[model samples]
Structure formats: structure tokens, C-alpha cells
Target: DTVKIDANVNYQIIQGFGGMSGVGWINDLTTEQINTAYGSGVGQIGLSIMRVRIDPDSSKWNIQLPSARQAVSLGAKIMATPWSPPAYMKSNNSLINGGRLLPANYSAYTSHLLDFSKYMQTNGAPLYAISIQNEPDWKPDYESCEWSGDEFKSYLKSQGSKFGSLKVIVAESLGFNPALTDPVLKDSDASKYVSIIGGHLYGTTPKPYPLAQNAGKQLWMTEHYVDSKQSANNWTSAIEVGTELNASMVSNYSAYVWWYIRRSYGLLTEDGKVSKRGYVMSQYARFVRPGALRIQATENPQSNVHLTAYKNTDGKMVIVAVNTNDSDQMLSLNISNANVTKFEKYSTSASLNVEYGGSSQVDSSGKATVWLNPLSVTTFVSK
Candidate 1:
């Protein structure tokens, strides 16, 4: 018998850190400032994974350290990626635009990564995962590196065996494009060495199952940011992200790591206030702890919002609803056959930036209809 109320959850997904550029809104944030930011009630939401960049150049190393320190202290599992190789290691002596790491400096580059790992460990910021390169295909005008599939595979074959069991995530391609994954997996010995294939959801649709089924590899939806150029504070973006999660899980994606979860379209806004996007994220982040298994939710809901549900380790059920339509939504949730009385409702809307709260009660039926505001995200938790 299947649980019928928006009941569709699959796979265990981990949400982690991204973009410690420190050059953006967080530039002036000191270590203490970061510590305070992370240590606030926000940290109580429970996060066990985090990601940061370890630039290959020694000069940019100092900039990332303070943020790295704050992440580690929150008891998060950390990972790092290199946006560019050192100037000396690259064909072009620049960190921006598109440059390839010079072939001769391959060994030095690998050692540089190792040195970073050691440095973090020494400074109490031990890492748990590392990606070989970020967006190996795109050559944008921004900070980027270019690597052909063969180049990436060759680098893996040469250096993958050396990292001593640190989980190696491979090929963080833009937009989860199959054109990108096929090349890396087919062109090189990368599959044998790499543990996870990372893809960004920038311009791609979530089809986790097909990608997982066809690639025969673990998949992660890495690095995505809100297009601040379009609409920085639009609450409907939360629904978009939720839809991505629904599609990603159905497609067999094992994890969803957002870009700057606290930044643009992030769970929180620049001023450290929460947004509807944050509420949508919490639908998954707050209830679906690191190890929680995504169950299943109903595909056809009475409301316009998209929803995903998960069962946490403590046996509590979390239902995340994303309302993107112009009108508010109401949902009649049925939690299998479990008798549910009390419910906690956390919402992010224009009315309440990103505050989370609980409701007084659930209806007498094993169901309740929720009034989800327009362009808002809500998470309903029942123990």
C-alpha cells in the first residue's frame, strides 16, 4: 500500500556549502562575524555538509581561510574546489576568463591540493570531499577553467589514486547537461577513479533517474545561484528550487547542494534575513537531515505548489511545499495511516521574511489543508 498524500520521496540527499568567494556580500565579514552568523539560530536548522573553494594560487589562499574556519566549527562535512589553477600552472597567467592548467604543472597542482588539505586539517578545517574542477566546459568571462573530458580523465587517472579515500567528486558541469557527462565518463578513466558526478542546475531540467540510470554513477546537483539580474528578492524562486528537487530526486540525484544557500535566492537574504526560498529549502533541509531518506509524495496536488516529503531519523515526517502561483495554495495532506494531531508550520513569504513557526493543530481527519501564500515556501512537520 502506498502513502497517498503528496507522498513521493526517494534517495538520501546531502545539502552543503558553496561559494566562499568572500569577494561578494560577505567580503567585510570577519572570522568573528562569520562565526556569529553561522552560530546564530540559523545553525540550529542542522547542516552536516559544507563546500568551499581552495584556489590553486597561493596568493588567494589567505582570503578563503577565515570562512573555512567558520564552516568547520559548525560541525559540517566540508569539500573544496578550484576555480582556477595558479597563474604559473595555467597556460594563460590569469585566474579569470578561460585558462587551462599547463600540462607541466599537473603534479604541482595536485600537490597544491594536497597542501590545502593539510593546511585545513592543521587549522581545524578538515575536508571530506574535493572536486577536480568547477565547470570544466564553460569558458565564461568570470573566474573559470577549461578542461576537456580527456584532460579531466587524465588528471584523475594521474592524481585520483593519491588522495587517500577523501571522496572525489568529478566534473562539476554547468546545467547537468548529458553532453558534458557523456564525454567525461566515456573519454577518460574518470569513472573508475571518481566517486560522484557533480552537475549544476543552472539551465537544465531535473531528470535524476535518467542521468543516474544511464551514467551508472552517483549524481549531485551542485552550484546554482539566483539570477539577481532578473529579480533578486522574488519569493517564487523557492517554488522553482523545490520543483528542481522534486525532479532531481525522481531522476535519481543523491544530493542537492545549492550555491550560496544564504545568499541570492539563498535560504537567507544578503542582510541575513530569511526569504521564501529559504523556507522552501528548509522544507528539505530542516526536516530531511543528512541521513534522512526521501520517501514519496503525491504528484497531483489540489494546490498549485510543488511538494516533496521526507522521513527523518527520529521518525518525524517533513512535507515541503512550494507555492509559485499568483494565488495562495491549500493542501490536504494525508500521512499514510499515521494519526497526526499537532503540526509545525514554517513559512517564508513577503509578510514574514523567513521566519518559521508551528501551527496550533491539525484537523480531526488524518489530513489538514494549508494556506500557502502566493510566491512562498512552507514546511509542515509532524512528529
Candidate 2:
């Protein structure tokens, strides 16, 4: 039997700033280089939202702000997040340590954020959303900050009053934890300004899906990367990660975002070659382009693989299948429900990512069984 899909509600949350690693790299990247990195070629694929990082210190503000404007010009919705406030604004007077901004600097912090918004707007990159901080509760050995629920709430109230019209995303927490919901959504006034609840998937499982759903906030998986040490030479890890997270987000009725779309440990592997991770992501990212709606997919007993489907604005049905098994698997697909006869397939393997193929025609059985390489991802477009 063919599975029916309703693809009217699909949306995208961009993985912005292209994953932060070092200020040196940011400084070394020229404006044209940054634009080329973000604006054109494969980097621009299936991207509708852009997450721009703003340093709170005024040192590189001029340099980074223009990079942000360039991204906006490429037809992306911009959202800004701060990794650290200026040294003078924080209690520690340093950007590397974990510290809180003095209460007296509340107004100054608010001004800084608003000034950023205005600066971007004046320079031609109006922001679609903003986060109070990158990882508020994280006190990493590196650059970090610590914000209790109360402290976060106070900042939100003060900042919200100043920029009430803008969409505010609160609690870019370290990872998925049910405890954050009450403090961020129920207990504090922060909810009033928050339109999106962003969290990292590090050291967490899919169990928090239901908890995040019940809180009445849109959930976004913000940051995560596969560690080469844990599952070296295996693309199944990436496939499993994308499939499982995609399933969880779709099942919970929320949008999903990947940490480093073009990194070595990301969907597209280091050399821009597609890995099983890319295959898994293409199941949604390629076929389910921005504005596509994710409909229900059939249940499978296989725990190593998952599937999601979407319909695009052009009335074409896109089905993405993720296979993380160590061995190749072939499955029959029935598509009579959507009256699709001719289709195309996009595959990402360890050797290539997002490579296109000729049209794949459905057979008389109203089913097509495609081979999924071990540790790879594939998508079928039926129209």
C-alpha cells in the first residue's frame, strides 16, 4: 500500500554562522570569501534561514555585520545570537570566562542588542529573530556564560520591552532537559517574548520530544557534531542521527536544524563529499525544501533506519529514506496515492553528496524498490 502525505506545512530553520570555531578564522575570512562560502554553490542549497552570530564586544562588529548583510541578500531569513558580551559589560571583565553581566549593565546590554538590530537594519539586513545568548547555562572551559532562570527572565523582560516586535528565541540551553521547560516557559516571564525554544542535542536522547511539545513552544535542535573517535569510518552514525532527530522533530511538530551542515562531521563530509549523513539529511533537506510540509510516514520495525516525506509547492512529492545499517537494504515503495509515475533520485554516499541522477520511473506494480547502500541516504522525487 502507498503512504499518503500532506506537505502543506513545511518550514526551515537555518544553521547560522556556519558553526563557530575560532575568531582567527573569522578574521581571516574576507568579505568576498565569506559571501562565497555562504551565498553561492552547494553551500546555498535548501537554505531559507540564516543564523548570524554577533560578538558583543565592539572589536569585530564592523567586519561581521557586513558579512551578515551579504547572507540576507541571498534570500534568507536572518537570526542573530551573541556568543559573548563585551568584556566591560561582564562581571569578569573578560570574554573567555563564565560570568554574568552586572544588573546595572542590563540597560547597556539591551542597548547593545537593539543597536545591533538597528545596525543590521540600517546596513540592509533586518533580523527575523534574536537569542539572548548562545549557550546561557553553559560554563565551558572556553568562552561561556551562566544565566539562572531568574536572571534570564529579568534580561528578557528588559530586552523584550525594548524590542517587543521582534521574534525572541530564549534558552539556547546546553542540551535537551525537561527541567529547562518550567524555568524558561512556565515559571518565568521569558515566555512572553519567546517564540522559539532552542536546545542542543549533546548528551541527550529523543526522550525529551514529548516534554518539549507539551510546553507549547516550537522546538529547534540547534547544535551537534559527530565525534570521529566514537564511530570512525561509519556514516551510519550520521544517518542515524539525522533520521532519528528528523523523526523526533517531525513527530513533535517542530522544525529541525543541524549544527554544521558543511563540516567534517556534518551531513556533507569535510571535503564537500556526501556521506551517509548527507544521504540521511537529503531525505528531508533536498526533497523537503523550504516551505514543504512534512506528512506522516509509514512505521518500520528497523531501528537503524527511518523515513520522512514532504510535498513541495510545485505539487511534487518528495520522499527521503535513511539507512544506517552496515549492509545495503532494498525496499519496495508504493506511490499510487500521489499519481506519480516519473521521478528523480538524489543519493549521497561516502564518495559523493547530493549527486543527481536521471529519472526513475515507477513500475506497473505501483511500487519501486531502490537499493540503499550501507551507511548512506537517498531521496526519491515522484511527480
Candidate 3:
């Protein structure tokens, strides 16, 4: 059972959903394949954003450009994140392991990042947002750079607006901790140049970023994954992924992005087949286009049900519900802020992977009851 949703009870205005295309995947997919991954119109789930890594070590920017171009051609928004600056610019002098950017070379590195964005655009893919560092809190074994909150804040206060239209996305922390954002957003001068407050869901919990809210920074759940295949199963991962995504939305994330878009254990499999996990992502990405506002939804009467709704700029309402239980449950959806009108439903379960379910009946009171499949994800769209 679900309660009533008020139009005024809205949360964040969603920017979009997207996936990354570097660190060994997605750059290999063909033109048709890229379309299948990023296309919004056809049988594919329309993803509004794309993320690419700007390899600071690589003198040439050729690998991820084609996929980025294809995504841009399909009307998708793109953001560029760097794993590390060139070894010459780092304190550790290595791209691998967690290293620090030299304060003395700060201006040089900033120029390089701005230069990378310009270079990518010149090669044909325009980047909408750029992150200063990926997970500055932790020094990973892989290619990564580290920065303290103060260092990040100092950079923002000093050189935040160095890039033209490329809005700054600060600190892709290991998780959704406010620690990374608090230092910078608390400082009014540094906060001004920042546009998006970004982070990952690692050893972190998604919580309200009141500072970013007050500062007008768009929040994004930058990276997440079900990493090990030994513990992986299709329906379980799908349901789990859906649950986490719902959690991110509830925490006020305008964008929920995954670690990789085309890995073997990713949304798409190694064989180039769209997996159930992919369909689960599509449940939200397909309906909640960019610029959609994530309005509040009624409380779920069932503990196993996770539900969220988004209202697009064109006035279409999209409700994404995931059932993590083993059996079907009847869900009563009441929209107090809306009226009875057109309806569409899509579901992904063991039997159907994002196949269109039957239309639901919305009474004059803006209430509708729909059957939720066992261990499945469903989306309801109302205009």
C-alpha cells in the first residue's frame, strides 16, 4: 500500500542518469552498440548523461572520444572525470596508487584539466561537467589522486572558475559523506564556482546535503557496483541495484551513475547482451528524462517496496517501484497532487525484462492500484 503524494512535496530536480566509458570498457562498442547503450527513444532506456575519464597520463585523447561523440550525437549530456594527473605533476610521481597533486604545480594541473576539456571538445565531444578528483579521501591501488578537504576548498576558492562553461564537480569521495562537501560548501567564496556536488557510494551512506542544497549545487551519486561475480546472481543484483538507486534518489541525488556501463558484471554483459540489471537502470533513466523533478511519493505500506516518482518538465509523472521480496504485492498508489488521465506501465522481472505491462486504472481521485511482480522493478508514467 502507498499513501498520497503532494505536488508541493517535491525534493531535488533530477539532472539525469548515466554510466562511465573508460578504465577498460565501453570504448570498444560500435556505433550501433553505443546507440543501444545511450539511446533514449527506441526499445533502449534513454540515458540523459555520459561520464568519461580524461587520462592525464595519455598525451593523446583518442580512446574514449568515439563513444563520447556517439553519446553526444544522441542528445546525451557528458561529464569528464580524471583518474590522475600525469606522473610528472604528482607528489608520488606515479599514476597508480593514491597520490597527491603538488601545491606548487597547482596552477599547471588546473590548466591541464581545462585544456583537456577543450581538447575533448575540439575532438568533437562536449563535456558538461568536470570533477577535480575521483575519491580524494582514499588512496586506491588503481590510478587515483588524493586531496584533503582544505586542499580541495583552496583550489575552488582560488581557481574554481578557470574553466569556461565546464561547471566544476567537487570531490568524488569514496562515499556519500558530507565531510568532503562541508569544507568547501561552507566557504562561500569556493562554493560560488562549484555547480555539482558529487561523490561515490562506497563505505558511505546517502544523506541530505543541506549545504549543497543551500548553495544550489546539484548532487550526484557518481559511482557504484556489485563488484564480485562470485556473489552475483541476475535477479538479486537487479533488485539490489534498484534498491540502492532508490536510496540515492531519496537522499536527494539529481543523478545516479554506475561504475561501468558495459562490463561482464555490469548492466551489459561481456557478450554485448542487455542484462536484467540494465533494464532495472532503464526503469528510471527511460522515464525520468533530464530536468525532471523528483517529487515526494507516499510511504510504502509494505516494507519490501521501494518507491520514488519524478515529474518531468513536460508534466509527465514517472513512478519507479522495486519489490525486493520473493512474492508479489498489491501496491495502492495515490497521487493527491494530480488528476486521472493517461497511464503507462513497464516492468522487469524473471519473465519480462523491461517489457510493457498492462495499463493501470487511475480513478478521478488520482488513485490507482497496481499488481507488483515478485522480485521485480516497475515504472508508472502518468501524463
**lDDT winner:** 3
CA RMSD of each candidate after superposition: 3.9, 4.2, 1.8
**Candidate 2: lDDT over CA atoms?**
0.61
Residue-by-residue lDDT tens digits, candidate 3, 13-90: 888888877644334666765687788664575676888888875565777788888999998888988888888888
- Please give the lDDT score for candidate 1: 0.65
User: Per-residue CA lDDT of candidate 2, range 1-383, in tens?
Assistant: 23434343443322322332223233433344434344434533344455666776656656655556666676666777787778788888877667888889889887898888888888788988787777776776666666776787777766666776777776777765545545656644666677777766676655445544555666665555556553323654555655665555445534455554445565444444544554545455545655565555564526555666666667777777666776777666665445567678776666656667556677775666656666666677885
Candidate 3: regions farther than 4 A off? 23-27, 230-233
Candidate 2 clash pair list: 10-292, 10-293, 16-51, 274-352, 274-353, 279-377
Q: How badly does each model clash, as a count of residue pairs?
A: 16, 6, 1
- Local distance difference test, per candidate? 0.65, 0.61, 0.80
Q: What C-alpha lDDT, on a 0 to 100 scale, does residue 172 get in candidate 3?
A: 90
| Candidate 1 segments exceeding 4 Å error | 1-10, 15-48, 183-189, 209-217, 230-232, 236-251, 260-270, 337-342, 353-371
On a 0 to 100 scale, what is the lDDT of residue 294 in model 2? 59
